[PDB]
Design a protein around this ligand. Structure first.
Ligand code: ADP
Ligand code: ADP
Ligand code: FE
Ligand code: FE
Ligand code: FE
Ligand code: FE
Lengths: 194, 194
C-alpha cells in the first residue's frame, strides 16, 4: 500500500492533492500513475514504487517561487538553482516539500521525482519509467505523442532518448534557457535513437 | 597586411589553402573573410583581424581524426576532446595546426578561430564577428539564412543568440550529440532573442 511509503492512504493523498493542484494537473498525475504502472510491468520495475512516484511527480507544481527559494536555502541546495524557475524547481526542489508533507523518505522514489523533468546522465529504471510516463500518459495530446508511445512500448532507453531530444529541440525552438542537467541526459541517451 | 600576423602573404596563404581544402570549402572561407570585414566595420572590430580570422577559420577542416588526436596529446588539451570529432576539433584543436603552419600567435585571432563552431559563455566582439560571419557568408543558402542576415545587420549579440538557438535546435532535431560548450553559449545569449 502507499502507506508503506507515505503518512496517509492513497485516497487521503488524492484528497490532499485535489486541494493543492488544479483539476487538469491532478488528472495528469493520475494518468502518470497509470502509465508508470504499465511501463514498470514492461521493464521490470516495482509497480508500486512506480505508481506512487508517478502520482506524486507533480505534487509541488504549484508552489510559489518564494517557497522554492526558501527550500533551496533551508536544505542548502545548489545555489545556482536560484537562477532558474518552476520548471527546474518543482521536481529538483519540490521533493523536499513532498518529504515534509508526506513523510516520504524512500530514496528511489525521491530520486525519480527529483529528476522527472531534467533526467540525469545516469538514471535508474525507475527514474526512466517516471520520466517517460510523464510524457506519454493518456491525457497528453501534443503532436508526436503517438511516436513516443510507440517507442515506449519497445524500449525504455529509446523512449528517454526520444523525449529528451524533442525537449531540447523544443526549448531551443522557443528560445528558452536549457538547464544543463538536461544536456547531460541528452548526450548520455541520444545514441539509443540509432 | 596579413604578414603582420602570419608567415606569408595573403596570396601565398590562398595558394596553400587551395591545396588543403576542397574548392567549395575555400570559397566558403573567402565568403567568411568578406562577411567578417563587413560585420567588423558595423560593430567596431579591427577589420584586418576579422578578415584574417574569417579566412582562416576552417583552415583545419580536412585534417584527419588521427592528426587531431595527435594534436590533443601533443598540446595536452582537455582529454574529453577525444570523445568528439571534426565538428568540435577543427576549430578547438585546429588552431594548433594553424599556429604551426603559419606562425600565428595573435591571441585574439586564435581565440576567434578556436570557438568559431561552439562559441563560449563569454565572447569578445571579434569572436562574435567570426561566429556570425561563418553562418551568414554569401555562399550559405540554408532555410532561414535570410533571417540571420537581417538580425546580423542590427545586432551582433542577437545574431549570436539566433545562430546558437538554431544550431541547438537542429542538432537535437537530427539526434546528434551537443558539445557542452555550445549550451554555455546558448544559455548566455538566448536572452537577446527578446
Ligand atoms: N532543461 C530544461 N530547462 C528549462 N525547462 C525545461 C527543461 N526541461 C524541461 N523543461 C520544461 O519544463 C516544463 C515541465 O516539464 P515536465 O516536468 O517534464 O512536465 P510537466 O509539465 O508535466 O510538469 C515543460 O514546459 C518543459 O518544456
Ligand atoms: N555543439 C556541437 N556539437 C556537435 N556539432 C556541432 C556543435 N555545434 C555545431 N556543430 C556542427 O559542426 C558543424 C560545423 O559547424 P561550423 O564550424 O560552425 O561551420 P562549418 O561547416 O563552416 O565549419 C555543423 O554541422 C554544425 O552543426
Ligand atoms: Fe513535472
Ligand atoms: Fe508531469
Ligand atoms: Fe567551421
Ligand atoms: Fe565555416
Amino acid at each position: 500500500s502507499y502507506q508503506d511509503y507515505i503518512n496517509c492512504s492513497r485516497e487521503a493523498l488524492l484528497e490532499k492533492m485535489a486541494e493543492l493542484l488544479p483539476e487538469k494537473r491532478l488528472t495528469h498525475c493520475l494518468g502518470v500513475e497509470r502509465a508508470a504502472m504499465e511501463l514498470a510491468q514492461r521493464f521490470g520495475v516495482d509497480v508500486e514504487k512506480a505508481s506512487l512516484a508517478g502520482l506524486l511527480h507533480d505534487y509541488a507544481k504549484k508552489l510559489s517561487d518564494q517557497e522554492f527559494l526558501v527550500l533551496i536555502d533551508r536544505y542548502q541546495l545548489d545555489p545556482d538553482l536560484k537562477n532558474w524557475g518552476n520548471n527546474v524547481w518543482h521536481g529538483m526542489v519540490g521533493i523536499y516539500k513532498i518529504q515534509e508533507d508526506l513523510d516520504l523518505h524512500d530514496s528511489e522514489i525521491l530520486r525519480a521525482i527529483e529528476i522527472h523533468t531534467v533526467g540525469a546522465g545516469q538514471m535508474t529504471d525507475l527514474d526512466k519509467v517516471i520520466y517517460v510516463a510523464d510524457y506519454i500518459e493518456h491525457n497528453r495530446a501534443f503532436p508526436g505523442v503517438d511516436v513516443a508511445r510507440e517507442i515506449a512500448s519497445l524500449s525504455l532507453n529509446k523512449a528517454v532518448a526520444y523525449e529528451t531530444a524533442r525537449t531540447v529541440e523544443y526549448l531551443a525552438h522557443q528560445g528558452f534557457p536549457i538547464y544543463p542537467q538536461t544536456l547531460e541526459t541528452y548526450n548520455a541517451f541520444v545514441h539509443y535513437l540509432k
